[PDB]
Amino acid sequence: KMLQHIDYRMRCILQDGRIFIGTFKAFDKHMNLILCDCDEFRKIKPKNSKQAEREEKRVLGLVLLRGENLVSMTVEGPPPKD
Amino acid sequence: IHPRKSYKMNSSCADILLFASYKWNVSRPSLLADSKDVMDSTTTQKYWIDIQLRWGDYDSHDIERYARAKFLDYTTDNMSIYPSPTGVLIAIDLAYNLHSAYGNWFPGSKPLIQQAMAKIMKANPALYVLRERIRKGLQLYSSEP
Amino acid sequence: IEMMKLMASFDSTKGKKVDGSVNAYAINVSQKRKYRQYMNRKGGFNRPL
Amino acid sequence: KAHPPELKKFMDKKLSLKLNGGRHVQGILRGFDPFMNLVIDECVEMATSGQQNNIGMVVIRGNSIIMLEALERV
Amino acid sequence: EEFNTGPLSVLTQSVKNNTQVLINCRNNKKLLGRVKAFDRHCNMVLENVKEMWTEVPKSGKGKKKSKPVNKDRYISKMFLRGDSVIVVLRNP
Amino acid sequence: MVQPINLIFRYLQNRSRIQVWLYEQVNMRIEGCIIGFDEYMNLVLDDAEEIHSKTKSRKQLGRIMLKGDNITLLQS
Amino acid sequence: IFIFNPRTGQLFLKIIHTSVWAGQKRLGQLAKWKTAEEVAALIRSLPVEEQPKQIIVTRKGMLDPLEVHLLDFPNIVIKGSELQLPFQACLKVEKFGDLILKATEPQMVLFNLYDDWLKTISSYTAFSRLILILRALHVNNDRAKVILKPDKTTITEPHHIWPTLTDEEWIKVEVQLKDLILADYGKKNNVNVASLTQSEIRDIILGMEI
Amino acid sequence: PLNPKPFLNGLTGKPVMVKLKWGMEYKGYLVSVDGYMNMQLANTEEYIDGALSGHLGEVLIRCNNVLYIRGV
Amino acid sequence: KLVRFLMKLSHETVTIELKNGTQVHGTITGVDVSMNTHLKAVKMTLKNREPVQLETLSIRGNNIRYFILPDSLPLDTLLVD
Amino acid sequence: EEPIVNRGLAAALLLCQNKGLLKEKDGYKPDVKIEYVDETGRKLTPKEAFRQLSHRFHGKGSGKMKTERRMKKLDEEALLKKMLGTVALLQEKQKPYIVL
Amino acid sequence: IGVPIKVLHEAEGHIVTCETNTGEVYRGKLIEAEDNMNCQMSNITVTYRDGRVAQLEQVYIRGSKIRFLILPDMLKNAPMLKS
């Protein structure tokens, strides 16, 4: 059911609350993740805020996330053209 | 089972048939309470179980004599076809709520039919409906706790 | 050597089947009572299976 | 199938271990298992109180080991 | 065989009789309920569980002054994953 | 070239005293002399005593056996 | 009729008018079955989620009419009580009292006898607090009233019943009402205070006899 | 001279006190121990921080949560 | 193995409380042998936050504290082998 | 009065007990359980266990209306046991004696 | 040995960063990366949860204590698309 989610813009929640969003490209038997285009969030995550929808944010790029620290997934938008 | 077999008093049939996947050593026909039982040196594969209900009057509510008599009547009868000569006949007295079987026993079948007959007289829903139908016919009730 | 007399080489039973009563599972199920039909069947007199 | 951690680069080297509960330790490596439990000679404990506590040969469970730093040049 | 003499005999003797067990879980919620089944990991599927834990009102005054209250919630049928089990306990 | 099990092998060849320190309970330490262990690294220990370091308390235990995935260290 | 929920504190107090039995020409053969039929009509009024399944009668001469009048609800349990609870202390407080007496029409006045103590503490210790208040107000009316306000500065809101106190004031007034209860009991029951264990203190505030 | 599963072999039936990693203690006659060293204790009394909060009966204590076993 | 009971439970609207307290209410779509739970029509309340509607979720199986199944479930025909 | 103590189980037992929520034969104990259940797994009353038996016996179950009453009764139990005081407090705070 | 561990196999000798279970993050160049995500890295800066910066020319971090690993996007195009 995860091969039905490849190359998506996936929102992966860690067990600390450090959220990622990026390219769900490769996963593993332990659900070790490989995410391109991924950026990180801690405090505010967007549902069209009254102030600004994306602060508490950092650029990282491509990550290998270990599956030991991983909780959930959600697609946020369709994959880009490239 | 024929639909009129529950009150087919003169003759009988079988109700349950147990297939062993082996050959059981089985015993001589002894009552449900006969704790010391000797082994009949035949070996069988299919084992029938009959359920004979009765409504005992005061003279003839001995369920052990009834189970023994019905077993040795119906196994040695012409008008009652059993799959094997080896099997058990459980008689249940509804008017006195008694139970005993008489026929042959394979290992473990005697404590199983003992405890199963105990739980089946304590907890059967059709027996329960019979019991409270008798209680509402007699207008006899117990005090609620 | 006493490391072989211990019966050495630190083990970790991950994936490997464990020794004994570790695998104990038990399920209490009781299915609905499949009774048979007697009245108004249209079928022949003995019971269906 | 447990391959040993690739640590003959770090044999007989002065390393500072980080251990689990914010802890720290220093010493010479003397060997390992596939489970990365490390045996250490000349172990100085180096707690967060600030005073350095020598022991000698100790064994450290590999579960608790966060990082190795080879203080000596490999 | 040794399914019925090990330390999981607390669970396979409580699922036979359908008696209730008390489980102190890992986040200190207490599950009272009848085991419908269990396995090696103590993945206990449970029926009719009272989940009883403790709260405080968490500084409702602004001065951090309150006493812990016993809260509980009912769950009809649950599948408790058995890593979070600390202790399972048959009733007296 | 010695191993960890070579150290604990030689150490219950010594039967001297050691102090195990735990996973993340940094104040909690347990002193003892190992009588036996095998490959899951659970250790029985001789006349063990819990020492709480920040209050320096020595609660006596006796013949103990401690579970393997809890230890961080064994210092002689 | 005082229909007190221990858990939700929802006191359904039914007003019974003077004209129901001033000209009734009947014995208690109307009275028992009448209070039973009216509490059953309360049960029939509420939805099935809010209907109880366990009903406790204080006075023992009511569970036998409650068996008769609640055969539409065989799901409910009608038990007696060994501990009697002083809900005449509810009559003694002026709000419920003149509410009852001024009421010209029989009605189904609701109350929440725990004011909002369910956001602060349990429902058990709120019940023990309420029965401390009610029994201490039963053993002495205005003495327990002036204990119930530890200062004369505190006030209760018109939607509340008891004065708004927090945990420190409530524990101090609870030990004051508690030794008031035991002092009145040991004054009357011939025996001192210090010969009783907390199980006996418990069933003296609860209403049982030792 | 005595390895851990021989030790737990040695104390199935005597009163012991097994200490959890979370500071709880359990006193009682333990019944049995598997390969993972889950424990079945009978006649248990639960000592929270050196003070008992109750007699409890029969308890299963999961293997991932024990800190040690003490023979009393 | 009890996880095999969960993969028989396809298309059920269950809630799941995780180890982070997050309650996830949704129709379960897939289970692995490691209880890797893939859900749809997800209403996820991460605790100390307001609940968020999301169309699809995939919880890792280690991070499940417990499940909550509805009233209408026939487990006596589900936990058989 | 007993709190479920953090780092403690036994207070929850003292809470739930307070709340009242508690031939050469083989040679063995056959634990016969004789149990009546419906398809949902509920333990069945002997009157309605006999009713299920008799529906299956006669081959003719209930009508539509009695099945409506029975099914709505079972979800009345389900909606009741899965659980107006706050509404009473909010109506009292809007003005104390909500007379019906 | 699946595709992410093959990706970190193809990140050997490259600039890589690892955030750890305690929260320290380690930005350097890798030397060895094994099956169990153990990483021996070099020329590396250590950033604690204090926010401070340190450097040392080598480190060896255990795999299970890795939280995650910042990889370079040299590997984003090659070679994992067919996945």
From Swiss-Prot, chain A:
Methylated by PRMT5. It is found in: Cytoplasm, Cytosol; Nucleus. Residues 1-79 form the Sm domain. It comes from the Eukaryota. Transmembrane segments: none annotated. It is linked to Cerebrocostomandibular syndrome: A syndrome characterized by severe micrognathia, rib defects ranging from a few dorsal rib segments to complete absence of ossification, and intellectual disability. Patients with the autoimmune disease systemic lupus erythematosus (SLE) have autoantibodies directed against some of the individual snRNP polypeptides. The most common autoantigen is called Sm. B/b' bear Sm epitopes. Plays a role in pre-mRNA splicing as a core component of the spliceosomal U1, U2, U4 and U5 small nuclear ribonucleoproteins (snRNPs), the building blocks of the spliceosome. Component of both the pre-catalytic spliceosome B complex and activated spliceosome C complexes. As a component of the minor spliceosome, involved in the splicing of U12-type introns in pre-mRNAs. As part of the U7 snRNP it is involved in histone pre-mRNA 3'-end processing. Belongs to the snRNP SmB/SmN family. This is Small nuclear ribonucleoprotein-associated proteins B and B'. The gene is SNRPB.
UniProtKB/Swiss-Prot annotation, chain C:
Phosphorylated in vitro by snRNP-associated protein kinase. Signal peptide: none annotated. It is found in: Nucleus. The modification Phosphoserine is found at S9, S12, S30. May play a role in mRNA splicing. Belongs to the SNUT3 family. Part of a tri-snRNP complex. This is U4/U6.U5 small nuclear ribonucleoprotein 27 kDa protein. It comes from Homo sapiens. The chain holds residues 101 to 151 of 155 of the full protein.
From Swiss-Prot, chain F:
Residues 5-76 form the Sm domain. It is found in: Cytoplasm, Cytosol; Nucleus. This is Small nuclear ribonucleoprotein E. GO terms for biological process: 7-methylguanosine cap hypermethylation; mRNA splicing, via spliceosome; spliceosomal complex assembly; spliceosomal snRNP assembly; U2-type prespliceosome assembly. Widely expressed. In scalp skin, it is present in the hair follicle, the epidermis, and the dermis. One of its GO terms (molecular function) is RNA binding. The chain holds residues 14 to 89 of 92 of the full protein. Core component of the spliceosomal U1, U2, U4 and U5 small nuclear ribonucleoproteins (snRNPs), the building blocks of the spliceosome. Most spliceosomal snRNPs contain a common set of Sm proteins, SNRPB, SNRPD1, SNRPD2, SNRPD3, SNRPE, SNRPF and SNRPG that assemble in a heptameric protein ring on the Sm site of the small nuclear RNA to form the core snRNP. Component of the U1 snRNP. The U1 snRNP is composed of the U1 snRNA and the 7 core Sm proteins SNRPB, SNRPD1, SNRPD2, SNRPD3, SNRPE, SNRPF and SNRPG, and at least three U1 snRNP-specific proteins SNRNP70/U1-70K, SNRPA/U1-A and SNRPC/U1-C. Keywords: Cytoplasm, Disease variant, Hypotrichosis, mRNA processing, mRNA splicing, Nucleus, Ribonucleoprotein, RNA-binding, Spliceosome. Patients with systemic lupus erythematosus produce antibodies which interact with snRNP proteins. Belongs to the snRNP Sm proteins family. It comes from Homo sapiens (Human). It comes from the Eukaryota. Signal peptide: none annotated.
UniProtKB/Swiss-Prot annotation, chain I:
It is found in: Cytoplasm, Cytosol; Nucleus. GO terms for cellular component: catalytic step 2 spliceosome; commitment complex; cytosol; methylosome; nucleoplasm; nucleus; pICln-Sm protein complex; precatalytic spliceosome. One of its GO terms (biological process) is U2-type prespliceosome assembly. It comes from the Eukaryota. The keyword Ribonucleoprotein applies. Residues 1-73 form the Sm domain. The chain holds residues 2 to 82 of 119 of the full protein. GO terms for molecular function: RNA binding; U1 snRNP binding. Core component of the spliceosomal U1, U2, U4 and U5 small nuclear ribonucleoproteins (snRNPs), the building blocks of the spliceosome. Most spliceosomal snRNPs contain a common set of Sm proteins, SNRPB, SNRPD1, SNRPD2, SNRPD3, SNRPE, SNRPF and SNRPG that assemble in a heptameric protein ring on the Sm site of the small nuclear RNA to form the core snRNP. Component of the U1 snRNP. The U1 snRNP is composed of the U1 snRNA and the 7 core Sm proteins SNRPB, SNRPD1, SNRPD2, SNRPD3, SNRPE, SNRPF and SNRPG, and at least three U1 snRNP-specific proteins SNRNP70/U1-70K, SNRPA/U1-A and SNRPC/U1-C. Residues 1-79 are annotated as: Sufficient for interaction with CLNS1A. Methylated on arginine residues by PRMT5 and PRMT7; probable asymmetric dimethylation which is required for assembly and biogenesis of snRNPs. Its main location: cytoplasm. The gene is SNRPD1. Keywords: Cytoplasm, Isopeptide bond, Methylation, mRNA processing, mRNA splicing, Nucleus, Repeat, Ribonucleoprotein, Spliceosome, Ubl conjugation. This is Small nuclear ribonucleoprotein Sm D1. The keyword Nucleus applies. Belongs to the snRNP core protein family.
